[PDB]
Amino acid sequence: MKRGFARPTPEKPPVIKPENIVLSTPLSIPPPEGKPWWLIVVGVVVVGLL
Amino acid sequence: KVVNSRLRELGEAPLEATGRGRWALCLVDGAPLRATQSLTEQDVYDGDRL
Known about the structure:
part of a larger assembly; 2 chains; A: 50 residues; mainly alpha; 1 helix; rod-shaped; B: 50 residues; 18% helix
């Protein structure tokens, strides 16, 4: 002999939330440059003058 | 009798005691069941332990 059991309507489960996410585009490296000749030309004169 | 018989087949000593008294079924706390009432009148169901 067993105890009786009647199943009721199921209780509400904890709601899941989906998510759509787009990533941030990475940072851009700077461009290289050629040294300023009309500056270094000045400096080599000054040290010579010294 | 059947419990003592099964115990002997298992190699265990049968139930024995000394002094004035009687043998009966009891709950985990030692409380004895009613000797004059049905197991259907008592709170016993399939899978219980006594």
